[PDB]
C-alpha cells in the first residue's frame, strides 16, 4: 500500500443536551486535511493542511453539503440503532464510520474500505470484494438485508474505484512536497540506571513521518519481544511522530543489547547500541 485516503465520522447522542454531535475528519496517509464539527458556530468542511486550501468554493460548498446531509442521516441511524438494540432514549450512544481507498505506487486501487461501529464495537463492514457485507450481530443483519435490497455496496464500489482514487491522486500531486516525502527517524539510545544491578536502555525515534515504524531490542541477537516496553507511537504536533522502546538490562551487560529501527525513510534498517 503506497498511499491511503480515509474519512472518519463520529456521531454521538447526548439526550437532554441537544441533537447528536457529528464530527468528521479526512486523512491522506497520516496527514489530516479536512474536518467538520456540527457543534462549531458555523459548521463547514474546513481545511487542515495547506495543499487542500487551493480547492475552490464549489469544492468546499459540496463537501459542506455532504457533511450536513451526513450529520442528519447519522442522527437517524442513532435512533434506528436504539430500536435494533431495545435501548432507551435516555442513554448516550456513538456510531463511527471509516471508509476510503488504498492505492499502490502506480495509483491503481489496492483496496477499498467501509466499516461501521456502534458503541465502539464492530457493526457492519463492506467486504474486500466491495460487493458483500459482514454483519457482526443480528441487528446489523437487519441493515445488511436493507443494504442488499438497495444495492448499497454498488454505490460504495463506484465511489471507492472512481472518485476516491481520483481525488486521492489529485491530493498526492497537490501535496507532493509533504505527502510524498518520508522523514526518517532521528535515533539514539539513552541509559538510565535504576539500581546497582539494573539499568534501562531506551531506544528513541523522533521526527519521523509516516507514523509506521518498527523498534526492536535484541539481546545477543535475539528479539526481546516479551521483555520490551514499547510506547504507542505519538504525534509531536509538527506532523511528525515519536516512539521509544525500552529494556531493563543487567549492569555490565549493556553492550549485549542492540536496538533495530525500520522506517520507510531509511535506505536500510538501523542498528544502535548504547
Amino acid at each position: 500500500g503506497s498511499h491511503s485516503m480515509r474519512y472518519f465520522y463520529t456521531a454521538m447522542s447526548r439526550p437532554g443536551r441537544g441533537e447528536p454531535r457529528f464530527i468528521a475528519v479526512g486523512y491522506v496517509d497520516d496527514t489530516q486535511f479536512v474536518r467538520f464539527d456540527s457543534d462549531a458556530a458555523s459548521p463547514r468542511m474546513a481545511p487542515r493542511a495547506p495543499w487542500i486550501e487551493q480547492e475552490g468554493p464549489e469544492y468546499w460548498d459540496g463537501e459542506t453539503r455532504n457533511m450536513k446531509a451526513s450529520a442528519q442521516t447519522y442522527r437517524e441511524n442513532l435512533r434506528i440503532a436504539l430500536r435494533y438494540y431495545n435501548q432507551s432514549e435516555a442513554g448516550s450512544h456513538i456510531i463511527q464510520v471509516m471508509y476510503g481507498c488504498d492505492v499502490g505506487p502506480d495509483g491503481r486501487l489496492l483496496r477499498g474500505h467501509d466499516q461501521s461501529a456502534y458503541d465502539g464495537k464492530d457493526y457492519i463492514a463492506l467486504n474486500e470484494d466491495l460487493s458483500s457485507w459482514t454483519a457482526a450481530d443480528t441487528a446489523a443483519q437487519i441493515i445488511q438485508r436493507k443494504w442488499e435490497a438497495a444495492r448499497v455496496a454498488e454505490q460504495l464500489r463506484a465511489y471507492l474505484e472512481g472518485l476516491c482514487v481520483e481525488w486521492l491522486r489529485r491530493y498526492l500531486e497537490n501535496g507532493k512536497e509533504t505527502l510524498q516525502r518520508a522523514d526518517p527517524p532521528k535515533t539514539h539510545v539513552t541509559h538510565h540506571p535504576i539500581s546497582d544491578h539494573e539499568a534501562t536502555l531506551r531506544c528513541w525515534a523522533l521526527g519521523f513521518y509516516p507514523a509506521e515504524i518498527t523498534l526492536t531490542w535484541q539481546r545477543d541477537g535475539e528479539d526481546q519481544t516479551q521483555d520490551t516496553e514499547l510506547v504507542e507511537t505519538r504525534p509531536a504536533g509538527d506532523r511528525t511522530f515519536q516512539k521509544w522502546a525500552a529494556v531493563v538490562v543487567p549492569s555490565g551487560e549493556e553492550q549485549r543489547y542492540t536496538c533495530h529501527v525500520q522506517h520507510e525513510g531509511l535506505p536500510k534498517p538501523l542498528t544502535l547500541r548504547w
Binding site: 446531509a69 451526513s70 442521516t73 441511524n77 434506528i80 435494533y84 443494504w147 465511489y159
Partner: peptide, 11 residues
C-alpha cells in the same frame, strides 16, 4: 473528497 451518494444509507 467524501462519499456523497444521492441517498446516504440508513441502518
Amino acid at each position: 473528497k467524501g462519499f456523497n451518494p444521492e441517498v446516504i444509507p440508513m441502518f
